[PDB]
Amino acid sequence: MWVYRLKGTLEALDPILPGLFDGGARGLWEREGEVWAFFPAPVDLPYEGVWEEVGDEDWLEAWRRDLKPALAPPFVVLAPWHTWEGAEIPLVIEPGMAGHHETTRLALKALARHLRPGDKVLDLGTGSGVLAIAAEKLGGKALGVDIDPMVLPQAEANAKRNGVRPRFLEGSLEAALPFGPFDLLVANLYAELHAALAPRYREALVPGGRALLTGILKDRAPLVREAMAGAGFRPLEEAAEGEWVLLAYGR
Ligand SMILES: Nc1ncnc2c1ncn2[C@@H]1O[C@H](CSCC[C@H](N)C(=O)O)[C@@H](O)[C@H]1O
């Protein structure tokens, strides 16, 4: 698809608009002093505007513009360019490819409840590092691990913008134990993997430590309940949003 970028406002260009539709324009977007006309392909136009084919970049970039703050009491997730006039705790997460998922939200909310200032936290499957950052904002000391190294520079970049500095490390539970035990572990994964890690979870946490598990589809919540009960944990709390569930356990 091609874009015909013109300078001016819609109100301003309103005259020559009719001619763009004739020329077969199927879309028009006023974007910061410029009017963008969309065509399947370039045509001949006396408007002396510039042509350019639309790419993924442009989409994401456009997606980036429609992005709105996300509430997750006591936090608000924001784009480095967002402005918030509230009393909620700000989290700035560059929309990069590595915080609007229902599970992240349940995680944040649960973290605020189970995290105490001075707690050592393990963000298992840190991704953007958002939860990691959140824990520091609550006064905790955190470690973020992920088997995917691709995400680690972004996470650290994110921490930076949030004026906080968690420890980030490529790996999984095992990569983490040397920095434990921890007071709390927060894991946004999936029901079956939790079920398999249940036993290693209790070894990562000091007695009384907390385990916050999310990324759980409602229809698979039973697997975690059983895995955790058997791993010796005790249920503490349950939260859901859509088809997603978060389960809180105490060791
Ligand atoms: N076994 C494993 N150990 C560590 N990270 C894992 C893992 N399996 C998947 N992941 C990582 O899990 C992350 C899940 S999504 C990241 C979500 C973020 N912590 C939040 O709360 O929203 C991904 O970044 C993925 O790379």
PDB file of C-alpha atoms and ligand atoms in Angstrom:
ATOM      1  CA  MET A   1       0.000   0.000   0.000  1.00  0.00           C
ATOM      2  CA  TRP A   2       1.249   3.508  -0.757  1.00  0.00           C
ATOM      3  CA  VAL A   3       1.062   6.744   1.143  1.00  0.00           C
ATOM      4  CA  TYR A   4       0.901  10.168  -0.434  1.00  0.00           C
ATOM      5  CA  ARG A   5       2.175  12.546   2.241  1.00  0.00           C
ATOM      6  CA  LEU A   6       1.053  16.162   1.909  1.00  0.00           C
ATOM      7  CA  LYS A   7       1.903  19.155   4.051  1.00  0.00           C
ATOM      8  CA  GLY A   8      -0.942  21.038   5.672  1.00  0.00           C
ATOM      9  CA  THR A   9      -4.043  20.246   7.679  1.00  0.00           C
ATOM     10  CA  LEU A  10      -7.245  18.606   6.499  1.00  0.00           C
ATOM     11  CA  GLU A  11      -9.235  21.792   6.992  1.00  0.00           C
ATOM     12  CA  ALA A  12      -6.532  23.498   4.964  1.00  0.00           C
ATOM     13  CA  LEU A  13      -6.354  20.932   2.170  1.00  0.00           C
ATOM     14  CA  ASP A  14     -10.119  20.398   2.176  1.00  0.00           C
ATOM     15  CA  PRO A  15     -10.164  21.973  -1.289  1.00  0.00           C
ATOM     16  CA  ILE A  16      -7.913  19.497  -3.103  1.00  0.00           C
ATOM     17  CA  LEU A  17      -9.265  16.555  -1.131  1.00  0.00           C
ATOM     18  CA  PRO A  18     -12.078  15.634  -3.500  1.00  0.00           C
ATOM     19  CA  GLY A  19      -9.389  15.084  -6.133  1.00  0.00           C
ATOM     20  CA  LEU A  20      -7.552  12.553  -4.030  1.00  0.00           C
ATOM     21  CA  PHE A  21     -10.629  10.352  -3.741  1.00  0.00           C
ATOM     22  CA  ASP A  22     -11.145  10.632  -7.475  1.00  0.00           C
ATOM     23  CA  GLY A  23      -7.536   9.577  -7.945  1.00  0.00           C
ATOM     24  CA  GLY A  24      -8.755   6.599  -5.965  1.00  0.00           C
ATOM     25  CA  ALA A  25      -7.588   7.342  -2.434  1.00  0.00           C
ATOM     26  CA  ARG A  26      -9.180   4.884   0.009  1.00  0.00           C
ATOM     27  CA  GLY A  27      -7.826   6.369   3.234  1.00  0.00           C
ATOM     28  CA  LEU A  28      -6.885   9.748   4.731  1.00  0.00           C
ATOM     29  CA  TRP A  29      -5.225  10.501   8.057  1.00  0.00           C
ATOM     30  CA  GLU A  30      -4.266  13.879   9.405  1.00  0.00           C
ATOM     31  CA  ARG A  31      -0.943  13.275  11.125  1.00  0.00           C
ATOM     32  CA  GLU A  32       0.820  16.292  12.659  1.00  0.00           C
ATOM     33  CA  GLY A  33       0.603  19.058  10.088  1.00  0.00           C
ATOM     34  CA  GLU A  34       0.497  16.495   7.323  1.00  0.00           C
ATOM     35  CA  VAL A  35      -2.371  14.814   5.560  1.00  0.00           C
ATOM     36  CA  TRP A  36      -1.743  11.234   4.453  1.00  0.00           C
ATOM     37  CA  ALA A  37      -3.543   9.790   1.478  1.00  0.00           C
ATOM     38  CA  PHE A  38      -3.585   6.055   0.975  1.00  0.00           C
ATOM     39  CA  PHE A  39      -3.590   4.389  -2.415  1.00  0.00           C
ATOM     40  CA  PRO A  40      -3.029   0.806  -3.548  1.00  0.00           C
ATOM     41  CA  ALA A  41      -0.264   2.242  -5.764  1.00  0.00           C
ATOM     42  CA  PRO A  42       1.093   5.640  -7.024  1.00  0.00           C
ATOM     43  CA  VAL A  43      -0.952   7.745  -9.463  1.00  0.00           C
ATOM     44  CA  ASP A  44      -0.651  11.090 -11.231  1.00  0.00           C
ATOM     45  CA  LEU A  45      -1.529  14.038  -8.994  1.00  0.00           C
ATOM     46  CA  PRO A  46      -1.139  17.873  -9.499  1.00  0.00           C
ATOM     47  CA  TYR A  47      -0.876  18.327  -5.754  1.00  0.00           C
ATOM     48  CA  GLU A  48       2.905  17.994  -5.745  1.00  0.00           C
ATOM     49  CA  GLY A  49       2.942  15.860  -2.621  1.00  0.00           C
ATOM     50  CA  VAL A  50       5.449  13.040  -2.018  1.00  0.00           C
ATOM     51  CA  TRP A  51       4.908   9.244  -2.557  1.00  0.00           C
ATOM     52  CA  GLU A  52       6.084   6.364  -0.387  1.00  0.00           C
ATOM     53  CA  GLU A  53       5.088   2.776   0.172  1.00  0.00           C
ATOM     54  CA  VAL A  54       3.765   1.782   3.595  1.00  0.00           C
ATOM     55  CA  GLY A  55       5.820  -0.728   5.585  1.00  0.00           C
ATOM     56  CA  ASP A  56       5.627  -2.539   8.927  1.00  0.00           C
ATOM     57  CA  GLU A  57       7.699   0.170  10.549  1.00  0.00           C
ATOM     58  CA  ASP A  58       4.979   2.698   9.675  1.00  0.00           C
ATOM     59  CA  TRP A  59       2.328   0.443  11.187  1.00  0.00           C
ATOM     60  CA  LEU A  60       4.025  -0.182  14.481  1.00  0.00           C
ATOM     61  CA  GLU A  61       4.970   3.463  14.495  1.00  0.00           C
ATOM     62  CA  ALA A  62       1.286   4.296  13.914  1.00  0.00           C
ATOM     63  CA  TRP A  63       0.277   1.679  16.470  1.00  0.00           C
ATOM     64  CA  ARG A  64       2.725   3.464  18.767  1.00  0.00           C
ATOM     65  CA  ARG A  65       0.683   6.621  18.390  1.00  0.00           C
ATOM     66  CA  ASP A  66      -2.617   5.078  19.453  1.00  0.00           C
ATOM     67  CA  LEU A  67      -1.069   3.664  22.590  1.00  0.00           C
ATOM     68  CA  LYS A  68      -2.763   4.608  25.852  1.00  0.00           C
ATOM     69  CA  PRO A  69      -1.660   4.352  29.526  1.00  0.00           C
ATOM     70  CA  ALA A  70      -2.611   1.087  31.227  1.00  0.00           C
ATOM     71  CA  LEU A  71      -3.950   1.036  34.765  1.00  0.00           C
ATOM     72  CA  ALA A  72      -2.815  -1.681  37.124  1.00  0.00           C
ATOM     73  CA  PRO A  73      -3.487  -0.316  40.629  1.00  0.00           C
ATOM     74  CA  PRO A  74      -1.314   0.946  42.224  1.00  0.00           C
ATOM     75  CA  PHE A  75       0.538   1.385  38.942  1.00  0.00           C
ATOM     76  CA  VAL A  76       0.071   3.041  35.596  1.00  0.00           C
ATOM     77  CA  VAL A  77       2.055   1.741  32.661  1.00  0.00           C
ATOM     78  CA  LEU A  78       3.189   4.403  30.229  1.00  0.00           C
ATOM     79  CA  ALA A  79       5.013   4.910  26.967  1.00  0.00           C
ATOM     80  CA  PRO A  80       8.179   7.056  27.310  1.00  0.00           C
ATOM     81  CA  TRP A  81       6.061   9.733  25.666  1.00  0.00           C
ATOM     82  CA  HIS A  82       2.972   9.413  27.856  1.00  0.00           C
ATOM     83  CA  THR A  83       1.846  12.069  30.332  1.00  0.00           C
ATOM     84  CA  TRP A  84      -0.053  11.096  33.486  1.00  0.00           C
ATOM     85  CA  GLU A  85      -1.763  13.393  35.969  1.00  0.00           C
ATOM     86  CA  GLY A  86      -2.626  10.785  38.588  1.00  0.00           C
ATOM     87  CA  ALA A  87      -1.475   9.548  41.963  1.00  0.00           C
ATOM     88  CA  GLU A  88      -0.746   6.060  40.651  1.00  0.00           C
ATOM     89  CA  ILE A  89       2.784   4.635  40.478  1.00  0.00           C
ATOM     90  CA  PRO A  90       4.243   5.261  36.967  1.00  0.00           C
ATOM     91  CA  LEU A  91       5.897   2.514  34.996  1.00  0.00           C
ATOM     92  CA  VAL A  92       7.528   3.485  31.716  1.00  0.00           C
ATOM     93  CA  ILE A  93       7.875   0.636  29.269  1.00  0.00           C
ATOM     94  CA  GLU A  94       9.169   1.315  25.782  1.00  0.00           C
ATOM     95  CA  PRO A  95       6.547  -0.465  23.599  1.00  0.00           C
ATOM     96  CA  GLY A  96       9.499  -2.361  22.109  1.00  0.00           C
ATOM     97  CA  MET A  97       8.952  -5.893  20.837  1.00  0.00           C
ATOM     98  CA  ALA A  98       9.813  -7.595  24.141  1.00  0.00           C
ATOM     99  CA  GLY A  99       2.695  -4.122  29.157  1.00  0.00           C
ATOM    100  CA  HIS A 100      -1.012  -4.352  28.263  1.00  0.00           C
ATOM    101  CA  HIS A 101      -1.486  -8.063  28.772  1.00  0.00           C
ATOM    102  CA  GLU A 102      -4.032  -9.173  31.353  1.00  0.00           C
ATOM    103  CA  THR A 103      -1.397 -11.407  32.981  1.00  0.00           C
ATOM    104  CA  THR A 104       1.177  -8.628  33.437  1.00  0.00           C
ATOM    105  CA  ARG A 105      -1.580  -6.600  35.073  1.00  0.00           C
ATOM    106  CA  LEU A 106      -2.534  -9.398  37.481  1.00  0.00           C
ATOM    107  CA  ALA A 107       1.197  -9.719  38.203  1.00  0.00           C
ATOM    108  CA  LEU A 108       1.633  -6.036  39.023  1.00  0.00           C
ATOM    109  CA  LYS A 109      -1.450  -5.950  41.214  1.00  0.00           C
ATOM    110  CA  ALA A 110      -0.407  -9.154  43.028  1.00  0.00           C
ATOM    111  CA  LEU A 111       3.173  -7.848  43.485  1.00  0.00           C
ATOM    112  CA  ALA A 112       1.940  -4.763  45.279  1.00  0.00           C
ATOM    113  CA  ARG A 113       0.079  -6.987  47.717  1.00  0.00           C
ATOM    114  CA  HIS A 114       2.672  -9.615  48.387  1.00  0.00           C
ATOM    115  CA  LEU A 115       5.872  -7.575  48.126  1.00  0.00           C
ATOM    116  CA  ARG A 116       7.299  -5.882  51.246  1.00  0.00           C
ATOM    117  CA  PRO A 117      10.015  -3.209  51.199  1.00  0.00           C
ATOM    118  CA  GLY A 118      13.423  -4.862  51.441  1.00  0.00           C
ATOM    119  CA  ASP A 119      12.266  -8.121  49.862  1.00  0.00           C
ATOM    120  CA  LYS A 120      14.491  -9.959  47.405  1.00  0.00           C
ATOM    121  CA  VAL A 121      12.571 -10.752  44.254  1.00  0.00           C
ATOM    122  CA  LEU A 122      13.001 -13.059  41.341  1.00  0.00           C
ATOM    123  CA  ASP A 123      11.197 -12.062  38.156  1.00  0.00           C
ATOM    124  CA  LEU A 124      11.162 -15.419  36.346  1.00  0.00           C
ATOM    125  CA  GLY A 125      10.704 -14.732  32.645  1.00  0.00           C
ATOM    126  CA  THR A 126      11.350 -11.009  32.967  1.00  0.00           C
ATOM    127  CA  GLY A 127      10.681 -10.065  29.361  1.00  0.00           C
ATOM    128  CA  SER A 128      10.552  -6.276  29.253  1.00  0.00           C
ATOM    129  CA  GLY A 129      11.561  -6.331  32.930  1.00  0.00           C
ATOM    130  CA  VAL A 130       8.425  -4.441  33.851  1.00  0.00           C
ATOM    131  CA  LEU A 131       7.634  -6.503  36.935  1.00  0.00           C
ATOM    132  CA  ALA A 132      11.326  -6.274  37.875  1.00  0.00           C
ATOM    133  CA  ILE A 133      11.120  -2.525  37.717  1.00  0.00           C
ATOM    134  CA  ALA A 134       7.831  -2.503  39.610  1.00  0.00           C
ATOM    135  CA  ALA A 135       9.408  -4.445  42.488  1.00  0.00           C
ATOM    136  CA  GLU A 136      12.171  -1.827  42.865  1.00  0.00           C
ATOM    137  CA  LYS A 137       9.519   0.907  42.893  1.00  0.00           C
ATOM    138  CA  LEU A 138       7.815  -0.884  45.788  1.00  0.00           C
ATOM    139  CA  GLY A 139      11.085  -0.869  47.669  1.00  0.00           C
ATOM    140  CA  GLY A 140      12.168  -4.433  46.899  1.00  0.00           C
ATOM    141  CA  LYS A 141      15.498  -5.730  45.485  1.00  0.00           C
ATOM    142  CA  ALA A 142      15.015  -7.676  42.250  1.00  0.00           C
ATOM    143  CA  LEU A 143      16.541 -10.079  39.825  1.00  0.00           C
ATOM    144  CA  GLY A 144      15.075 -10.599  36.369  1.00  0.00           C
ATOM    145  CA  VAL A 145      15.949 -13.757  34.396  1.00  0.00           C
ATOM    146  CA  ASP A 146      14.830 -14.904  30.931  1.00  0.00           C
ATOM    147  CA  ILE A 147      15.983 -17.704  28.705  1.00  0.00           C
ATOM    148  CA  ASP A 148      15.824 -15.210  25.826  1.00  0.00           C
ATOM    149  CA  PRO A 149      18.853 -12.821  25.725  1.00  0.00           C
ATOM    150  CA  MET A 150      17.149 -10.751  23.058  1.00  0.00           C
ATOM    151  CA  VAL A 151      15.025  -9.157  25.756  1.00  0.00           C
ATOM    152  CA  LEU A 152      17.776  -8.235  28.236  1.00  0.00           C
ATOM    153  CA  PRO A 153      19.027  -5.026  26.637  1.00  0.00           C
ATOM    154  CA  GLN A 154      15.474  -3.624  26.452  1.00  0.00           C
ATOM    155  CA  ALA A 155      14.715  -4.515  30.040  1.00  0.00           C
ATOM    156  CA  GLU A 156      17.835  -2.702  31.224  1.00  0.00           C
ATOM    157  CA  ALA A 157      16.943   0.168  28.940  1.00  0.00           C
ATOM    158  CA  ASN A 158      13.514   0.193  30.598  1.00  0.00           C
ATOM    159  CA  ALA A 159      14.900   0.148  34.123  1.00  0.00           C
ATOM    160  CA  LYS A 160      16.995   3.170  33.161  1.00  0.00           C
ATOM    161  CA  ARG A 161      13.999   5.247  32.110  1.00  0.00           C
ATOM    162  CA  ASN A 162      12.403   4.264  35.400  1.00  0.00           C
ATOM    163  CA  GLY A 163      15.334   5.497  37.408  1.00  0.00           C
ATOM    164  CA  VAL A 164      15.769   2.114  39.064  1.00  0.00           C
ATOM    165  CA  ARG A 165      18.269  -0.708  38.678  1.00  0.00           C
ATOM    166  CA  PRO A 166      17.226  -4.389  39.081  1.00  0.00           C
ATOM    167  CA  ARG A 167      19.643  -7.175  38.245  1.00  0.00           C
ATOM    168  CA  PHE A 168      19.030  -8.758  34.877  1.00  0.00           C
ATOM    169  CA  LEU A 169      20.331 -12.128  33.843  1.00  0.00           C
ATOM    170  CA  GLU A 170      19.907 -14.621  30.979  1.00  0.00           C
ATOM    171  CA  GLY A 171      18.693 -17.942  32.301  1.00  0.00           C
ATOM    172  CA  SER A 172      15.972 -19.723  34.249  1.00  0.00           C
ATOM    173  CA  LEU A 173      15.385 -20.894  37.880  1.00  0.00           C
ATOM    174  CA  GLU A 174      18.793 -22.525  38.042  1.00  0.00           C
ATOM    175  CA  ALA A 175      20.575 -19.452  36.719  1.00  0.00           C
ATOM    176  CA  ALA A 176      18.946 -17.689  39.654  1.00  0.00           C
ATOM    177  CA  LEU A 177      19.405 -19.826  42.801  1.00  0.00           C
ATOM    178  CA  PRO A 178      22.922 -18.413  43.415  1.00  0.00           C
ATOM    179  CA  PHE A 179      21.294 -15.046  44.110  1.00  0.00           C
ATOM    180  CA  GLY A 180      18.624 -16.531  46.302  1.00  0.00           C
ATOM    181  CA  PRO A 181      16.868 -17.592  48.184  1.00  0.00           C
ATOM    182  CA  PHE A 182      14.259 -14.953  47.551  1.00  0.00           C
ATOM    183  CA  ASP A 183      11.393 -13.588  49.561  1.00  0.00           C
ATOM    184  CA  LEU A 184       9.276 -13.517  46.463  1.00  0.00           C
ATOM    185  CA  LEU A 185       9.095 -14.947  42.965  1.00  0.00           C
ATOM    186  CA  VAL A 186       6.823 -13.634  40.285  1.00  0.00           C
ATOM    187  CA  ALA A 187       6.305 -15.792  37.160  1.00  0.00           C
ATOM    188  CA  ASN A 188       4.209 -14.935  34.093  1.00  0.00           C
ATOM    189  CA  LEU A 189       4.513 -18.189  32.174  1.00  0.00           C
ATOM    190  CA  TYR A 190       1.936 -20.894  31.566  1.00  0.00           C
ATOM    191  CA  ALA A 191       0.059 -23.574  33.588  1.00  0.00           C
ATOM    192  CA  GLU A 192       2.063 -26.652  32.500  1.00  0.00           C
ATOM    193  CA  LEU A 193       5.525 -25.157  33.053  1.00  0.00           C
ATOM    194  CA  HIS A 194       4.494 -23.940  36.501  1.00  0.00           C
ATOM    195  CA  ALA A 195       3.218 -27.448  37.263  1.00  0.00           C
ATOM    196  CA  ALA A 196       6.712 -28.728  36.397  1.00  0.00           C
ATOM    197  CA  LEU A 197       8.578 -26.048  38.363  1.00  0.00           C
ATOM    198  CA  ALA A 198       6.346 -26.230  41.490  1.00  0.00           C
ATOM    199  CA  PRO A 199       8.942 -28.284  43.409  1.00  0.00           C
ATOM    200  CA  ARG A 200      11.894 -26.044  42.398  1.00  0.00           C
ATOM    201  CA  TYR A 201       9.831 -23.027  43.417  1.00  0.00           C
ATOM    202  CA  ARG A 202       9.796 -23.964  47.098  1.00  0.00           C
ATOM    203  CA  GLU A 203      13.581 -24.369  46.978  1.00  0.00           C
ATOM    204  CA  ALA A 204      14.084 -20.909  45.535  1.00  0.00           C
ATOM    205  CA  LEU A 205      12.147 -19.224  48.317  1.00  0.00           C
ATOM    206  CA  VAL A 206      13.055 -18.817  51.967  1.00  0.00           C
ATOM    207  CA  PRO A 207      10.498 -20.467  54.227  1.00  0.00           C
ATOM    208  CA  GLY A 208       7.452 -18.199  54.246  1.00  0.00           C
ATOM    209  CA  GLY A 209       8.508 -16.878  50.831  1.00  0.00           C
ATOM    210  CA  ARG A 210       5.822 -16.100  48.286  1.00  0.00           C
ATOM    211  CA  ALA A 211       5.190 -17.540  44.822  1.00  0.00           C
ATOM    212  CA  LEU A 212       3.165 -15.481  42.339  1.00  0.00           C
ATOM    213  CA  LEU A 213       2.159 -17.499  39.284  1.00  0.00           C
ATOM    214  CA  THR A 214       0.364 -16.177  36.246  1.00  0.00           C
ATOM    215  CA  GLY A 215      -0.099 -16.745  32.512  1.00  0.00           C
ATOM    216  CA  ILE A 216      -2.641 -19.333  33.608  1.00  0.00           C
ATOM    217  CA  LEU A 217      -5.629 -20.079  31.424  1.00  0.00           C
ATOM    218  CA  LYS A 218      -8.722 -20.705  33.556  1.00  0.00           C
ATOM    219  CA  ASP A 219      -9.254 -24.132  32.051  1.00  0.00           C
ATOM    220  CA  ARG A 220      -5.760 -25.163  33.219  1.00  0.00           C
ATOM    221  CA  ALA A 221      -5.754 -23.675  36.706  1.00  0.00           C
ATOM    222  CA  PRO A 222      -6.276 -27.183  38.268  1.00  0.00           C
ATOM    223  CA  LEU A 223      -2.837 -28.326  37.132  1.00  0.00           C
ATOM    224  CA  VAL A 224      -1.171 -25.559  39.126  1.00  0.00           C
ATOM    225  CA  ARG A 225      -3.341 -26.053  42.196  1.00  0.00           C
ATOM    226  CA  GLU A 226      -2.353 -29.739  42.309  1.00  0.00           C
ATOM    227  CA  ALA A 227       1.312 -29.138  41.448  1.00  0.00           C
ATOM    228  CA  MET A 228       1.578 -26.459  44.154  1.00  0.00           C
ATOM    229  CA  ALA A 229      -0.394 -28.312  46.846  1.00  0.00           C
ATOM    230  CA  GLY A 230       1.872 -31.321  46.201  1.00  0.00           C
ATOM    231  CA  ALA A 231       4.969 -29.092  46.179  1.00  0.00           C
ATOM    232  CA  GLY A 232       3.885 -28.155  49.698  1.00  0.00           C
ATOM    233  CA  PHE A 233       2.556 -24.641  49.078  1.00  0.00           C
ATOM    234  CA  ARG A 234      -0.734 -23.324  50.387  1.00  0.00           C
ATOM    235  CA  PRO A 235      -3.189 -21.238  48.355  1.00  0.00           C
ATOM    236  CA  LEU A 236      -3.248 -17.583  49.317  1.00  0.00           C
ATOM    237  CA  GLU A 237      -5.052 -15.713  46.603  1.00  0.00           C
ATOM    238  CA  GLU A 238      -6.604 -15.946  43.155  1.00  0.00           C
ATOM    239  CA  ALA A 239      -7.192 -13.279  40.573  1.00  0.00           C
ATOM    240  CA  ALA A 240      -8.546 -13.467  37.048  1.00  0.00           C
ATOM    241  CA  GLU A 241      -9.028 -11.187  34.053  1.00  0.00           C
ATOM    242  CA  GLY A 242     -10.683 -12.592  30.988  1.00  0.00           C
ATOM    243  CA  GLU A 243      -9.369 -16.112  30.452  1.00  0.00           C
ATOM    244  CA  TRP A 244      -6.335 -15.336  32.525  1.00  0.00           C
ATOM    245  CA  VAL A 245      -5.627 -16.222  36.113  1.00  0.00           C
ATOM    246  CA  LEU A 246      -3.037 -15.452  38.755  1.00  0.00           C
ATOM    247  CA  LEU A 247      -2.437 -17.707  41.739  1.00  0.00           C
ATOM    248  CA  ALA A 248      -0.635 -16.730  44.941  1.00  0.00           C
ATOM    249  CA  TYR A 249       1.071 -19.238  47.190  1.00  0.00           C
ATOM    250  CA  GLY A 250       3.067 -19.170  50.382  1.00  0.00           C
ATOM    251  CA  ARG A 251       5.960 -21.500  51.173  1.00  0.00           C
TER     252      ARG A 251
HETATM  253  N1  LIG B   1      11.658 -21.530  31.331  1.00  0.00           N
HETATM  254  C1  LIG B   1      11.788 -20.196  31.220  1.00  0.00           C
HETATM  255  N2  LIG B   1      12.688 -19.495  31.999  1.00  0.00           N
HETATM  256  C2  LIG B   1      12.854 -18.138  31.928  1.00  0.00           C
HETATM  257  N3  LIG B   1      12.141 -17.325  31.074  1.00  0.00           N
HETATM  258  C3  LIG B   1      11.251 -18.009  30.296  1.00  0.00           C
HETATM  259  C4  LIG B   1      11.026 -19.379  30.302  1.00  0.00           C
HETATM  260  N4  LIG B   1      10.020 -19.718  29.349  1.00  0.00           N
HETATM  261  C5  LIG B   1       9.679 -18.581  28.829  1.00  0.00           C
HETATM  262  N5  LIG B   1      10.360 -17.467  29.329  1.00  0.00           N
HETATM  263  C6  LIG B   1      10.281 -16.146  29.078  1.00  0.00           C
HETATM  264  O1  LIG B   1       8.956 -15.799  29.598  1.00  0.00           O
HETATM  265  C7  LIG B   1       8.631 -14.480  29.287  1.00  0.00           C
HETATM  266  C8  LIG B   1       7.022 -14.593  29.383  1.00  0.00           C
HETATM  267  S1  LIG B   1       6.198 -13.105  29.005  1.00  0.00           S
HETATM  268  C9  LIG B   1       7.190 -11.786  29.871  1.00  0.00           C
HETATM  269  C10 LIG B   1       6.174 -11.185  30.777  1.00  0.00           C
HETATM  270  C11 LIG B   1       6.453 -10.256  31.906  1.00  0.00           C
HETATM  271  N6  LIG B   1       7.389 -10.728  33.027  1.00  0.00           N
HETATM  272  C12 LIG B   1       5.056  -9.962  32.503  1.00  0.00           C
HETATM  273  O2  LIG B   1       4.841 -10.148  33.685  1.00  0.00           O
HETATM  274  O3  LIG B   1       4.191  -9.549  31.671  1.00  0.00           O
HETATM  275  C13 LIG B   1       9.232 -14.264  27.918  1.00  0.00           C
HETATM  276  O4  LIG B   1      10.009 -13.077  27.898  1.00  0.00           O
HETATM  277  C14 LIG B   1      10.051 -15.620  27.651  1.00  0.00           C
HETATM  278  O5  LIG B   1      11.241 -15.392  26.901  1.00  0.00           O
END
